[model samples]
Target: RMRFTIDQNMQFPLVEIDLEHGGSVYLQQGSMVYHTENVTLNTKLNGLGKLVGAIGRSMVSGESMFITQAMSNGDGKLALAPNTPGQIVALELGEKQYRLNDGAFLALDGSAQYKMERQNIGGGLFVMTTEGLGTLLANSFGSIKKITLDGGTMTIDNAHVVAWSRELDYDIHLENGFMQSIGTGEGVVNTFRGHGEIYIQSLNLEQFAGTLKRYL
Candidate 1:
């Protein structure tokens, strides 16, 4: 059970993490704001032993290709902030697994492993995902709303979804046909089933260029 401290929760929010002796953390490259002297920072090639995978992730998501790691020689402090104005969401991983929407990932404890997955929507819509196995940190473009389902069904505009349990089977598609979507301005939507938790943000990302790469 690890926790992150939110130095700021409204508007421009930041997260502070206290690293125990010998503790380590992995964060998106270029996201760290500050750190105590006892903590060492290093950036490495994405060696999930899958350089191609890492490159593909960076190319599709536009996140940095390098991985940034922080190690604590002793008790140390580190801080981070999201690129956009929003609230920070901390999730406990390992105990449960969830799929993070593109750009939702902020950082995670070293105890976790991460990977990028993709869902090809139609022939043009491609969605990127972050899956983790440890304490994970994410940010929302706005406030976050989490829902608990009990063998229920739910539909959400893809733009507002921050994270969701992978076990909750779902399909993502445009709410309307191509022409209708253009007419209605409604984009990708996800219909989920079964019992699980889902997190949605209060704001929908701008539908830029009829694609979501900029949102991530």
Candidate 2:
């Protein structure tokens, strides 16, 4: 019962979802989908692996969470990957790390490790470690934004975005662009894009926004 247009012209070709009941409609030109669900759908794509879904769970410690896309409600921190997946190096976030194995995902309990690839891919991804943390970590895309990828790129920790690929390059915006990011009365608005994949958590980081924010 909702609709919109993708102002941008991008092609998010790969389409995959593990949700069995939710209704979803894809917008070809927009490269996005119109999905309706009685429950939330946590989604992820494992760079050439099967699509993974994290639903009805928060811990994401054992089987449900793996090398694929993982999401949390921001109650606690999802540990890092522990061991290397036979791949040459691992992406390290401070002391934690992660690497992709083949199909399975590995999480570091006391530690964590994950693997990543710079391939062109797109999809929704989610993972939360703490509850209220959602206010700081997870949210929807920015209402206004810009991109500046001269050499490597800019990475920001302010945006409400939950998680993004370590492989993709991006930057953040604060002024004169996305009016939403201003933190006045909108979700974190800013712009980020490059030749890499990024994971955005549900649009409703807050209970109120869930009823208003619509991606069509």
Candidate 3:
């Protein structure tokens, strides 16, 4: 059982997961209304195009890596995986906090408020925490290889990025010939590419290909 406490007005993602195999997931509120406001979910699927698995009676868990988006009036999609085995993707939740498994393969965005102190993992692998508190907004997509960038930067892309450096200044763009960027592969391919650090998830949304475009 893992424990965590966060103050109010301080919004971010809170995730608890079991990666090895799917099982029952239990969620219970821990504090006053102010201490915790809401909860959201992010997830990826397996090569077989499965996102959740059932372990026992009425409970479902993820077979792939998933994250929770900070609740805002409550809405958004979280979590992702590969269309094929051996393909990996990165996750970047604005300014969320994630406590990953000790040896899990994860690539996180460079957010400003990522808290990185745990008893299990000696030294955090990648950008687990940031210098101060601030929101770093960037486009999110499916892919591996997360990028970390420095402050004072600008980036634009035709297609959505898998994830980008939380530390850099970036935005999603739609320029000339931008519509065919991904070329029916995904409906938009020519990514603007930013100056700061960016992580490209190895897995594309091929399994659910072109399905998420409506939201774009």
Candidate 4:
């Protein structure tokens, strides 16, 4: 059995994992902070296909090309924290595949499969997808909210989207007329339709950065 704990709710989150002998977990490169005795860390490629897929994702999806794996030889603990301040949460995944925003993927438990997919929308956006039964850890720039669509539609700013289900179809469009969109500063938006779930962040980092620049 594996035990997972998340420290510090949303301000500055840390994920700690306690693993019994023979248990293992995969994490994003550079996220591991510390570990107890009997835990060993290794850098590994999932497979030839996954390596090639990761290369493509790094080129277009902004994902890291490498992943880190940690295993417990005996009872031990491992801790990890994302580079940015945000919230961390676990996703229970099944056979169905799910898509995640670039830079949001944090870690996974068990033998979950991962791949890169092209959105083919504006600027050829791409996403990381995972399938099979496992636990998925993702970090956000702010508080995260899940929106369920029961054959409904929702529009979100591109920068605020964290992840979305594979069952949804999306298109990119200007929030208003071309000039108005630019003038109001909303710019392009992603419109999602069909039945699925969307994960969004409460804060927009890009917009926040722009606001910070004014004082600089």
Candidate 5:
């Protein structure tokens, strides 16, 4: 059995995990903060069938080419944190799939496999889809909100997207007429339809960074 815990304090939650003997976890490279001596770490190219496919997926999805795997020989604990200050979400899965925005993934059990999702959204948006999962940990730049759709559509700003269910259909479009959209400072919007769950963050990190840069 494995136990997972997220440290309190919403600003940059820390992930602490305990794995039993023979248990393993896979995560994005450089996510690990520390671990006990009983845990062994190794790096691998995860996704697709071969090395070439892994490289392609990493290049297109804006994810690291290599992922880290931590295995425990005995009762062990590992600590991890994301690059941004935000909240962390825990998802449990069994033969299910989920879609994640670039930079959203933090860690997961070795039971899951992730691949690049090719999206036709303008400006070449990329997403990673996971299949066969045990537990998934994702991070967001701010408070996370979840929306469940039942044969309906919800529109959200592209920059706020964190993750969504694979069962949902989504497309990207300008929220208003082209001229009006540009003038209103509202750019491309992501429209999701069908029955599934969508996760979004309250803050837009890209926009926040841009605004902060003006003062520097």
Candidate 6:
């Protein structure tokens, strides 16, 4: 596995991963901060496959999901930071599985890998999921809080969810009934059940974008 360090301060923190001889890591576009001479950066498709592989994912997901693959021929360091001011958390992939909210993945190292799957939301939401072992870096728009549900249930604003354990069952819908949500100024929400862990952001990036509409 790769070695990494996320700043102790959660607010707007960055991560630096140390690569061993011939080690590799994947990074989100525009997330690279700095790197050493031994590290070479390149890009590749999601590597989902060849049939409906990269090209197919690009079309259906509308994500152009290109990943920056960095490999170190020798010992070196690569530093990365999130595009938004928020919290960055490392998820241990082999210990527990996780599905990331769209745009929540920052960088990953070791044996980690992710894929986009069709979600059950009509045809709009594509589930970004982790499918290998290693350390996965996930970021949120603001602060992040971890929720461990032993056997309980919880509902969260759709935009606030950062990621959740793949073992949990979840569904998305209006927080209140459609009519009531309109009156209460609430919109879509995600509810989770069973035993698992979840991460939620303190600020909703979607809502923040909406607020910017007036000023921008």
Please report the candidate that would top TM-score against the real structure: 6
lDDT of 5 by residue, 78-135 (tens): 9998877788988877645688877788887876677765576553566777778488
The reply for model 2, stretches above 4 Å from the true place, is 1-108, 111-160, 177-184, 206-216
Q: What's each prediction's clash count?
A: 0, 36, 23, 0, 0, 0
- Per-residue lDDT for 6 in model 5? 93
TM-score of 2: 0.24
TM-score of 1: 0.77
Candidate 5 or 4, higher lDDT: 5
Ranking the candidates on TM-score from highest down gives: 6, 5, 1, 4, 3, 2
Give lDDT tens digits, candidate 6, residues 99-147.
8777788888747777776566523665677778889999999888999
TM-score of every prediction relative to native = 0.77, 0.24, 0.29, 0.77, 0.82, 0.84
Model 6 worst lDDT run, 10 consecutive residues? 43-52
- Which pairs of residues collide in model 5? none
Per-residue lDDT over 1-216 for candidate 3, one digit per residue giving the tens place of the 0 to 100 score? 112222223222223222111211111112112222233322232132232232221122222222222332322222322122332322334443222222222323212333333322113222233333332222223423555443444342323244344334433334336456446443323222234455453444443555776877
lDDT against the true structure, each candidate = 0.74, 0.28, 0.31, 0.77, 0.81, 0.81
Residue 170, candidate 1: C-alpha displacement in angstroms? 2.3
Once fitted onto the true fold, the runs of candidate 3 whose alpha carbons sit more than 4 angstroms away are 1-143, 148-160, 177-196, 206-216
User: What lDDT, from 0 to 1, does candidate 4 have?
Assistant: 0.77
Give stretches of model 5 more than 4 Å off.
Answer: 9-11, 45-66, 121-124, 173-182
lDDT of 4 at 123: 40
Candidate 1 per-residue lDDT, tens place, 1-216, comes to 234788753467778889889888878677799999999997635235567776666766544453578889878898888865677777777657777777677887787766554566632333333445567787788888889888989998888887887678877777667998788777788888998888888876665434767566
Residue-level lDDT for 11 in candidate 1: 65
Angstrom error of the Cα, residue 26, model 2: value is: 36
Which 10-residue span in candidate 3 carries the lowest summed lDDT? Answer: 23-32
lDDT of 4 at 33: 94
